[PDB]
Amino acid sequence: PAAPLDVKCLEANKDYIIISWKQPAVDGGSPILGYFIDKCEVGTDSWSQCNDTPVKFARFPVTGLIEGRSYIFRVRAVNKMGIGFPSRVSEPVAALDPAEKARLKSRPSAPWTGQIIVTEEEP
């Protein structure tokens, strides 16, 4: 089956993140029995399958989030024959309550300045 489209995050919390997606183009090969959702902690390259059996409902709550860490998501469609390739991955989603994300986003940090690199140029 064709890969699902437009993976986005509807809602996000320390506890769980609810992610949705657009259904792929109807190939008529075998009806889509459901979908598998995979999560990855942004830094690592470890992709883990969130649901053990397929889900039909095109919005899904993801659990098992380490608080304060940011995650990306992909979806794979599944039919009778097997599983398709993954969707284009989502924008990163941080596992924070909305107020803490707002707080961090609008927080000042003292400036840092790099070494001054001096070079000669020719008039």
């Binding site: 390259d45 992709w47 940011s70 990306i72 284009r88 941080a94 940090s109 840092w112 690199i117």
Partner: protein, 98 residues
């Protein structure tokens, strides 16, 4: 506040024309010298003929993907880590097909 760009905020989307090169520049600070690596769509990016990575003279690390194809679209992440911690920056590449 080492939060890193495009991780908490939504990453920027930069469009590139198919067949042309795309340069990704990212400056990083840390003691000790933080070791950096690139990722694409949650997969590690590895030096190829097509994909090249070097540190630009005058500071920051560069990733260069040559001869962009539609399939090259995705989330590009610059991960940097040292003994004290790790921080990521992210960005999205879209490809303009002729």
């Amino acid at each position: 506040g080492p939060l890193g760009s495009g991780i908490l905020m939504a990453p920027k989307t930069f469009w590139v024309n198919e067949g042309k090169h795309a340069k990704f520049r990212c400056y990083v600070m840390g003691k000790p010298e933080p070791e950096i690596e690139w990722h694409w769509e949650g997969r590690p990016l590895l030096p190829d003929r097509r994909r090249l990575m070097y540190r630009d003279r005058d500071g920051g690390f560069v990733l260069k993907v040559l001869y962009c194809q539609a399939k090259d679209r995705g989330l590009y992440v610059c991960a940097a880590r040292n003994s004290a911690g790790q921080t990521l920056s992210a960005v999205q590449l879209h490809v303009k097909e002729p």
